[PDB]
């Protein structure tokens, strides 16, 4: 036995389909470790989760553990170069990231198949000897502030922190987690506090081995991985740090029976109901939280939400167990509010308790629990193959809370039925123990309090005893009934035999004037489920802003008529998605194949026999109206990407255009739109999964025949199947389209360097070049110069036309343009001075990314589907383009750069979108030409050509 290892649990409870082998072990210093050996993985990955979170932050230094996690990436004493950790992963087709939750600081990364040892050596040094360079502390603090400035105006984070402010002020639950520049450098130097030493005071007192968990995934054997982890992580300093618990509740009686009227940024109307409950993570064997969450958050027949639809008060409801920390949890029941549902809040909550007592009346239902036990064991047995990076991060988090032998069955399987624990939680859900919160702009001007961190104006008022006592006498409502037997639970998991004529890529098996079917039976994953994607085409889905609205409202009403029916199938892992596109409708049905056609049939039947409820039309059209105006509050970097898509697309309707034409959407016009939309269709579909070729053709005939016999569908002409083109830019042209952002104080920018049409030469020219500047653009533009948090540089493929794009969200003026051009010159000298060894280190890096095997069924279907929507159908694009990628020379890329992308390039096609804030109008930058300011989109597209479309194979 190795004395650096305390115990080794070799038998980890595994899914019988999981061909990966595991081994859990606990080192002598306390680090819980799980080892995953997948001899076929193309990306090795590891992750570490420290059990110290932002709750342990010093009170005077808000958000220190989060600041710590940013500073660990910037160097250790054995790897002192500031980007060595980031660059080594970039050169070997890997990525890395981390986050700071309340009780965890979780680091993770993926790396190349064969380079696990090199990266894990650099990764382990974070916990042994980090430099905390003061030149890096003075800069990366600005990247943390930009992380806050991007979230300051986000309503989800504003409510997240407003919950913190209402509790006991000196409970650590009220602590600020993110932390801006104020809490990190402006305040501590103002009071004489060495922040860098406080990082060490925190790192050398909390980052102990007994609070760490490591997961490592790679092709190396379990024994080679065991020796690989003990050599790097057994020398982590153990310090016997006590496990931080918070047994005292953050909400005492002073904070109960309280209502909070909040003003949101967006025009949203939500109602949050919170019930404080004890810590339930010790009863995970029974999990009484998901039992009550399953019934309250139920949306089926006689459910709680389905009745709130009948009265036009609510549109969505989520309810159940909400994680808090060790020692306390919450039980939420959050709902959307209609225009009338905001005015009848009390009856909503009364109807909530009218449901809760129906659960108290009929007592616990053991048949519901055992159904959950059945559904989860099946969903776990046929669990999809996870991605290595997210898998290790997730397991490293739950590795603290469960024995090694049950880390895989922890979140999934339930074992004991405990009606005593259900009664315990159900007993603590009374109005005497309630907290209400109303989010609505109808309250603006009537708020008397201001939260300090986000500026969210709200008002606190106590619930009248009249209302509480009325809620205490919650009588049993007739319209509430327990959910009936979920009959969508799949019974047949038979893996259909693989055909001898089966194909490795989707095969066009049917070509009619109506439909074109793409089919491949699953020959890789062998799971009893299938993906059914349909792309219905109709020009009247995007002719004018009126029709595109009705294309959405039709499909949005269509899911409202199916929520009762579909929720049972959703619980059986049989989900469906339906949404309007610019070309028509998009239906995607994924999940178990057993009862799949039954769901697909009712979607198509009600698609052709739909009858609008006048009550639910006006409700959704109201919500759709607020959804179009709530885009002004989106972050500027999303306004940058939005405007560029409207510029470089043949035709596109703005949010404002759809909103102005929504006043013309009357119910009679929408009723006459459906027969006109469903008049002529063309069905391009992909049926990939556990189905035969005869069934796939039979499934397609179900969609054809159902639309013919109920919508009299007529085959569409092929000359009408015109997909939109991309605007072809002029040589040496620089266009700038700028517009203001009404909410945010930062600037957004997207610099598009349009290269040429997609081709195996042009595609791998850019993907290799985008790979080379992938790391340097992130380092020079964010870590070194600290422009902002959002720094992205990659390829942009759209409508068969591609190019190189830079998306930056900063507090600096679109100076951003100068820097991006100045950064390109830094790369041009870098490639000339780039060694041949370091050059193909990038080529083999890109080849790993492209040839990365899709690990789950839904991932392969989307990869095929991408070729189908793009009308290219290059299904072997991976193997084809990598063969050409390896043939490129460094001299080939420089000729590509100097001809297409350089500042003096003869074929530079540069367009910039500048999303300005509300009051803004030593590496030296090159001389930039005076650009032509785009004034009108329609006049702009009128004077330019349109690129062709990629010819299919």
């Amino acid at each position, epitope marked *: 036995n190795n004395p650096a290892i305390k115990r080794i649990g070799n038998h980890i409870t595994k899914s019988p389909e999981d061909k990966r082998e595991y081994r859990g072990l606990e080192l002598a210093n306390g680090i819980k470790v799980l080892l995953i050996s997948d001899p076929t993985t193309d990306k090795s990955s590891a992750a570490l989760d420290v059990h110290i979170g932002s709750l342990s932050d010093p009170p005077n230094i808000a958000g220190l553990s989060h600041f710590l996690e940013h500073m660990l990436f910037l160097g250790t004493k054995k790897y002192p170069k500031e980007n060595e950790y980031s660059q080594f992963l970039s050169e070997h087709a890997g990525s890395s990231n981390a986050f700071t939750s309340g009780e965890h600081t979780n680091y993770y990364f993926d790396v190349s198949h064969e380079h696990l040892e090199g990266a894990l050596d650099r990764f382990a040094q974070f916990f042994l000897s980090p430099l905390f360079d003061e030149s890096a502390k003075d800069r990366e603090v600005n990247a943390v502030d930009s992380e806050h400035e991007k979230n300051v105006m986000n309503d989800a984070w504003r409510l997240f922190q407003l919950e913190k402010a209402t509790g006991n002020p000196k409970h650590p639950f009220s602590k600020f987690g993110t932390g801006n520049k104020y809490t990190l450098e402006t305040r501590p130097n103002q009071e004489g506090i060495d922040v860098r030493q406080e990082l060490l005071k925190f790192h050398s007192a909390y980052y102990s081995s007994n609070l760490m968990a490591v997961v490592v995934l790679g092709r190396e054997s379990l024994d080679d991985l065991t020796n690989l982890v003990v050599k790097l992580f057994s020398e982590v300093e153990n310090k016997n740090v006590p496990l931080p618990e918070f047994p005292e509740h953050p909400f005492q009686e002073e904070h109960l029976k309280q209502l909070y009227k909040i003003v949101p940024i967006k025009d949203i109307r939500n109602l949050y109901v919170t019930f404080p409950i004890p810590d339930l993570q010790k009863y995970y064997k029974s999990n009484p939280g998901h039992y009550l969450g399953h019934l309250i958050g139920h949306e089926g027949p006689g459910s709680l939400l389905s009745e709130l639809k009948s009265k036009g008060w609510v549109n969505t409801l989520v309810g159940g167990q909400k994680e808090g920390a060790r020692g306390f949890m919450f039980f939420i029941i959050n709902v959307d509010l209609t225009e009338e549902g905001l005015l*009848h809040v*009390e009856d909503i909550i009364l109807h909530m308790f009218q449901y809760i007592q129906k659960l108290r009346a009929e007592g616990p239902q053991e048949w519901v629990f055992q159904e959950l036990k059945d559904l989860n064991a099946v969903a776990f047995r046929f669990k999809d193959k996870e991605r290595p990076r997210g898998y290790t991060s997730k397991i490293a988090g739950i590795l603290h809370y469960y024995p090694l032998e049950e880390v895989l069955t922890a979140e999934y399987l339930l074992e004991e039925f405990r009606p005593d624990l259900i009664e315990m939680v159900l007993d603590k859900l009374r109005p005497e123990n309630v907290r209400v919160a109303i989010v609505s702009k109808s309250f603006e001007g009537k708020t008397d309090r201001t939260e300090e961190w986000y500026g969210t104006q709200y008002k606190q*008022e106590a619930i009248p005893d009249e209302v509480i006592k*009325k809620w205490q*006498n919650a009588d049993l409502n007739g319209k509430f009934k327990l959910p009936t037997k979920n009959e969508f639970i799949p019974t047949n998991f038979e893996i259909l035999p693989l055909e001898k004529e089966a194909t490795p890529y989707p095969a066009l098996i049917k070509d009619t004037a109506m439909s074109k079917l793409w089919f491949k039976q699953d020959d890789k994953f062998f799971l009893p489920k299938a993906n059914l994607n349909f792309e219905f085409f109709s020009p009247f889905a995007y002719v004018d802003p009126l029709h595109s609205n009705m294309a959405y409202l039709y499909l949005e009403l269509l899911k409202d008529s199916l929520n009762e029916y579909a929720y049972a199938a959703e619980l059986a892992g049989l989900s469906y998605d339906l949404q309007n596109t610019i070309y028509g409708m998009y239906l995607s049905v994924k999940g178990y194949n057993d009862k799949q056609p039954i769901l697909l049939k009712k979607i198509i039947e009600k698609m052709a026999t739909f009858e609008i409820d006048e009550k639910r039309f006006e409700i959704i059209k109201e919500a759709y109206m607020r959804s179009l105006n709530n885009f002004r509050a989106e972050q500027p970097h999303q306004h940058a990407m939005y405007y560029l898509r409207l510029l470089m697309t043949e035709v596109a309707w703005t949010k404002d255009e759809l909103k102005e034409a929504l006043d013309d959407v009357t119910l009679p016009r929408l009723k006459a739109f459906i027969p006109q939309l469903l008049s002529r269709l063309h069905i391009e579909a992909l049926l990939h999964g556990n189905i035969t070729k005869q069934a796939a053709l039979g499934i397609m005939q179900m969609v054809e025949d159902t639309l013919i016999e109920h919508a009299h569908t007529k085959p569409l002409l092929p000359s009408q199947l015109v997909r939109y083109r991309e605007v072809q830019l002029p040589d040496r042209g620089w266009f700038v389209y700028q517009q203001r952002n009404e909410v945010h104080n930062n600037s957004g920018i997207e610099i598009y360097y349009q290269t040429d049409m997609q081709s195996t030469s042009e595609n791998m020219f850019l993907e290799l070049f985008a790979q080379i500047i992938s790391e340097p653009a992130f380092n020079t533009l964010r870590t070194k110069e600290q422009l902002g948090y959002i720094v992205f540089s990659g390829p942009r493929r759209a409508n068969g036309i591609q190019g190189l794009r830079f998306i930056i969200q900063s507090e600096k003026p679109p100076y951003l343009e100068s820097r991006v051009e100045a950064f390109l010159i830094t790369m041009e000298k870098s490639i000339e001075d780039m060694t041949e060894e370091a050059f193909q280190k990038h080529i083999q890096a890109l080849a790993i990314r492209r040839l990365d095997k899709p690990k789950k069924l839904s991932a392969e279907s989307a990869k095929y589907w991408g070729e189908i929507i793009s009308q290219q159908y290059n299904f072997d694009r991976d193997n084809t383009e990598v063969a050409y990628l390896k043939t490129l020379t460094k001299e080939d890329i420089i000729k590509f750069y100097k001809e297409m992308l350089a500042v003096d390039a003869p074929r530079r096609h540069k367009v910039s979108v500048h999303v300005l804030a509300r009051e803004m109008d030593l590496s030296q930058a090159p001389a930039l030409p005076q650009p032509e300011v785009i004034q009108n989109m329609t006049e702009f597209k009128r004077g330019l050509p349109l690129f062709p479309l990629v010819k299919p194979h």
Partner: antibody
Amino acid sequence: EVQLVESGGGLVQPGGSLRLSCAASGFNISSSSIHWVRQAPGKGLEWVASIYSYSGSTYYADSVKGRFTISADTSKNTAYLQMNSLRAEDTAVYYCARHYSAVAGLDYWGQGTLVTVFN
Amino acid sequence: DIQMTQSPSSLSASVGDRVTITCRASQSVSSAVAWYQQKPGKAPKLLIYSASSLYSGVPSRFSGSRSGTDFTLTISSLQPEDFATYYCQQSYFNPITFGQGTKVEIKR
């Protein structure tokens, strides 16, 4: 000193508009529910509407839903009821009352103003 | 939504007589009913809340009861300050409804 004072009552023509005000004194209105109760001369009691001054603003009766708009201002500690599309049916004495700390209350009533709808 | 009926439309009793007035509901209403006294001209006065609880400052001769959908206000001994119009209420987050009224007329 817990009293309620109605105001704003007088003469209106059909289709006109009135806005009544119930001035609360001796307690904050966000503490309990305010109700409006009218009485036509010769008839019994009739429930007009109610306002929950903290939130969950409006609960109206089927006989006035759509014609009446009830509101309140916590800073003024006062509740209002604007009356639109007035019929000859709505001529009545409009009482305003505080609800008790129970399920069935209305313990404190007021003077009650007169709304006459006529030429 | 839910409506309230009356037991008598009017009655005639003497001083010392016992008065029992009944309202009856349409649907099941668990307590949540109040009795009011309105002397002609001025505002009504609350008598019984929660269909049984005697309001503070109300003479003890008043008592409210509940039997399913029936609510009975019993005055043990009528008196010169006890003759007026008597209404009952309904309290639920539905529209509050009243009774037609009971006009207890004394007789000397």
